[PDB]
Amino acid sequence: QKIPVKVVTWDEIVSLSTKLAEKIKADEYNVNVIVAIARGGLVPARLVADVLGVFDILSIKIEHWIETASHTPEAKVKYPFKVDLSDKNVLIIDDITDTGDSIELARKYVMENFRPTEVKTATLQYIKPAAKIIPDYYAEEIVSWAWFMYPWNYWEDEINLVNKILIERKTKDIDINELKRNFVESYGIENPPISLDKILTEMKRRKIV
Amino acid sequence: QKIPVKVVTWDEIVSLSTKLAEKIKADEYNVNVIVAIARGGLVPARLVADVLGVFDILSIKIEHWIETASHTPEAKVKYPFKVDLSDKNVLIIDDITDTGDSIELARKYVMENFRPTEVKTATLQYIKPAAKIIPDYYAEEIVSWAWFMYPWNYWEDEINLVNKILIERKTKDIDINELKRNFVESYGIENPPISLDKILTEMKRRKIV
Ligand SMILES: Nc1ncnc2[nH]cnc12
Numbered sequence: 242q243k244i245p246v247k248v249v250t251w252d253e254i255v256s257l258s259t260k261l262a263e264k265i266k267a268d269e270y271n272v273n274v275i276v277a278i279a280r281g282g283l284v285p286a287r288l289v290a291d292v293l294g295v296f297d298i299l300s301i302k303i304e305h306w307i308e309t310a311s312h313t314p315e316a317k318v319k320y321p322f323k324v325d326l327s328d329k330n331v332l333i334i335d336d337i338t339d340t341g342d343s344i345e346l347a348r349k350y351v352m353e354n355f356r357p358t359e360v361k362t363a364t365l366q367y368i369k370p371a372a373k374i375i376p377d378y379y380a381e382e383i384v385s386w387a388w389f390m391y392p393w394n395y396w397e398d399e400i401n402l403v404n405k406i407l408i409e410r411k412t413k414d415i416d417i418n419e420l421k422r423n424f425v426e427s428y429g430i431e432n433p434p435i436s437l438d439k440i441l442t443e444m445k446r447r448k449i450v
Numbered sequence: 451q452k453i454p455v456k457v458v459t460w461d462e463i464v465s466l467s468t469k470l471a472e473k474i475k476a477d478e479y480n481v482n483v484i485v486a487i488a489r490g491g492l493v494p495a496r497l498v499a500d501v502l503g504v505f506d507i508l509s510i511k512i513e514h515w516i517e518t519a520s521h522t523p524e525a526k527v528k529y530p531f532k533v534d535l536s537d538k539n540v541l542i543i544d545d546i547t548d549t550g551d552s553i554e555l556a557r558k559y560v561m562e563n564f565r566p567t568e569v570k571t572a573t574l575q576y577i578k579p580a581a582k583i584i585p586d587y588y589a590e591e592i593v594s595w596a597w598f599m600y601p602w603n604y605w606e607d608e609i610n611l612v613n614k615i616l617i618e619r620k621t622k623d624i625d626i627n628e629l630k631r632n633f634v635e636s637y638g639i640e641n642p643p644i645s646l647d648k649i650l651t652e653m654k655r656r657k658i659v
């Protein structure tokens with residue numbers, strides 16, 4: 242019932258994004274167009290583009306669906322479109338390769354619909370034990386599964402982590418102090434980037450509580 | 451010949467992005483889809499999405515062209531596509547409104563090709579004196595023109611700032627100490643986020659020097 246959670250800072254994102262770009266430099270892959278996987282790849286896409294000198298970034302939104310009875314997972318491009326990237330070297334970017342389901346779909350999608358000369362894949366992180374497909378480049382190998390909390394995800398991640406606690410509670414409990422204590426117990430996070438009272442307020446606004 | 455340059459940190463981006471989101475919360479605009487203007491809007495787009503709870507982000511790349519003899523400016527969507535966003539509330543996001551040429555184009559483009567129920571515009575910064583169009587939301591009003599150096603633009607911006615200095619001189623064996631001095635004199639930057647020796651190396655790699 243504990244979940245391993247790792248808080249990632251902006252300094253780490255800069256550091257990881259730069260290291261990722263350096264691998265691509267060293268490999269002398271000449272990137273013309275970066276395709277970001279939305280939403281997780283937008284930020285790393287931009288930073289890699291800055292270091293490598295890539296002017297053209299596009300994005301595709303990938304949704305993840307689960308069938309209730311079978312527990313079957315399915316990944317889908319939402320708002321799919323076509324453009325002509327023939328004559329271009331494409332780099333697909335996302336934040337993390339977990340199962341590898343996302344970069345697998347992105348790669349197929351891009352090859353069929355953008356028809357680029359070449360395609361490669363890159364993510365900041367790569368979970369060795371979990372990944373069915375290995376991205377062509379990654380900045381950091383992860384050998385033990387954890388949930389990575391990115392700085393562009395602090396609100397949503399904390400909202401979901403709070404929710405996971407609240408639905409266990411047999412009797413409602415507003416004592417923010419209980420909530421904070423559980424957060425430490427369950428997630429190992431003594432100081433959430435966004436304070437839990439702010440998270441609660443926002444959950445109310447959204448009609449989540 | 452001096453250029454007013456403002457270095458923007460990540461802490462400022464987080465702060466600005468959040469303030470921008472708060473204005474949108476307060477205004478009770480219910481955003482379904484964020485359309486980011488690439489490349490400048492990708493990062494702010496992501497952060498705003500996190501704070502507001504928006505799952506769908508798309509992007510359009512906007513180029514800026516200048517006619518040599520006439521000095522006529524023209525902004526153009528590159529790799530244009532169409533998708534169906536009817537029944538959706540769209541928020542278009544960019545880093546800065548300078549002339550306003552970009553958000554003007556984006557807005558027209560989006561209404562004509564995505565066909566959303568409603569469209570609004572947002573940027574982190576807005577230059578009052580320069581802007582011919584005004585974004586619906588902005589985090590910070592700028593009353594005196596400056597070049598804003600964003601954290602996702604440090605390499606490219608510094609490369610261009612270095613170049614502007616090098617073309618004034620004839621003597622072609624680059625003195626780094628001279629270069630650093632000029633950087634302070636021309637831009638007011640004593641401590642560039644990326645060290646100029648790294649910038650120079652990268653300019654070489656790209657065949658810029
Ligand atoms: N392990 C993980 N951490 C953060 N984001 C993810 N998205 C999919 N898997 C993830």
Ligand SMILES: Nc1ncnc2[nH]cnc12
Nearest residue numbers: 546548596597598599600
């Ligand atoms: N004044 C400015 N600062 C940073 N980026 C820009 N892009 C267009 N105008 C800009």
